[PDB]
Design a protein around this ligand. Sequence first.
Ligand SMILES: C[S@+](CC[C@H](N)C(=O)[O-])C[C@H]1O[C@@H](n2cnc3c(N)ncnc32)[C@H](O)[C@@H]1O
Ligand SMILES: C[S@+](CC[C@H](N)C(=O)[O-])C[C@H]1O[C@@H](n2cnc3c(N)ncnc32)[C@H](O)[C@@H]1O
Lengths: 236, 240
Amino acid sequence: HHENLYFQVYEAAYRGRGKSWHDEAADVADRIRAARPDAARLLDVGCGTGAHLETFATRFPHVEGLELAPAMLALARHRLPGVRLHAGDMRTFDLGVTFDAVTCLFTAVNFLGTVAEMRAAVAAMSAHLAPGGVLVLEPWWFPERFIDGYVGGDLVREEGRTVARVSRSTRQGRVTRMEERWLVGDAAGIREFSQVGLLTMFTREEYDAAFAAAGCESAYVEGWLTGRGLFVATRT
Amino acid sequence: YFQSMFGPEHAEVYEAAYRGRGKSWHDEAADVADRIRAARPDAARLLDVGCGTGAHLETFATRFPHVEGLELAPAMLALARHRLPGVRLHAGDMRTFDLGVTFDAVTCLFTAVNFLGTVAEMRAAVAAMSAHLAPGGVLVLEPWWFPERFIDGYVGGDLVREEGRTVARVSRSTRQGRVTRMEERWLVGDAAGIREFSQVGLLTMFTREEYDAAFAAAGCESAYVEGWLTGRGLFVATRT
Ligand SMILES: C[S@+](CC[C@H](N)C(=O)[O-])C[C@H]1O[C@@H](n2cnc3c(N)ncnc32)[C@H](O)[C@@H]1O
Ligand SMILES: C[S@+](CC[C@H](N)C(=O)[O-])C[C@H]1O[C@@H](n2cnc3c(N)ncnc32)[C@H](O)[C@@H]1O
């Protein structure tokens, strides 16, 4: 007989829906080490809450983060005691040092609006790679793969609350419109919440072209733990 | 924001929810039909009062030659006709309807009577239904009782994923006296988009003493069946 309980914002939500930043980071680290057994320096770009980095730190002596939103740069530092974090734009940063690996996960690069912007980002990351360094990038769905009008839904049971969520994803051009609507029922009442988020899709040929332009040989791992696959490139 | 219950949106999703939690209108109607035959072996004409979508009536029709329905919300009576092409269905109020005809049995199931607000209204309903009974006719009524655990408040949640639509529901019910305040909030996502609609309803309990008095006031000898397939038991009365 025993019981568990946790207590005390996007990350909590995806964790409740079943996402494991730890398993993802571990798998990513295994693959980085496959290509680069001596990897020691890692930079996570668009780290957000730094959940991935929490696990990367257990695997690489030195790890760093790059983040544009200072509200998230706050939370990451809090959860990441010994981690050097930099405020910056992925499209523009320069830190004067190389890394054995640069990661860009959970569709972070798809927060850029144009192919010209994504290619500048991919080139920046590649610039911070030492020779043979590994670039890892989790892309947002490929236009060919993107179901349109896709409707998702999940029911999460939290402490004191039941949460319903229905989503709908639509496209206009290359831009993807995810409409999320939550229902939160608890002691005080039922609250409704609605969100929309926009990610700009790129094609496999577009990523592959951006890698090559920045001197990296790319490969794509179908599926992976998220469903969106994984690019693993090396800077030749 | 809030609408009244049993509108068109509610009618579309109303059965999906209770079936997903394990309700079988078929088994209920079948059991009800068996008991009607116990008390009235020759029963042939049946009327379901507050039939809603007619889910019960669907199985009653396979068991009784002539079957009819009475329903106030036209959105529920619409789907009722849809599901029951050749069945005379009537728009009416439980408290006042008059169809000029008697039946061998009149049913009022799934706490339909407890959507009335006062004891006087239930007694008018119970008296109206009894007027539509032939001598020896059977009245069967599923009353609302408070679940053993529902002391103050309850929060429910449901997600059914169908092919072509997903339906989410968060509910909240609070109790005070004999009144339960039902707040339901739905999310339907489908080909066309994401729709939300919200409802509030009042369910009012009546006492065993009140039912027994309403039946007697209406010329009926009553009896109560413990438990039943829902948990709320079942009143079965006969028209002397
Ligand atoms: C959901 S993604 C973060 C993915 C993160 N690795 C995770 O899994 O939690 C959003 C983050 O990307 C960062 N980001 C977006 N555009 C950026 C840009 N141009 N330069 C740097 N960071 C950027 C923002 O700061 C934001 O915190
Ligand atoms: C949701 S339950 C439906 C019961 C139905 N037999 C079933 O199990 O599906 C309550 C129903 O009572 C009906 N109703 C409520 N008050 C009524 C009244 N005064 N007269 C007739 N029908 C009424 C509503 O239209 C609603 O469909």
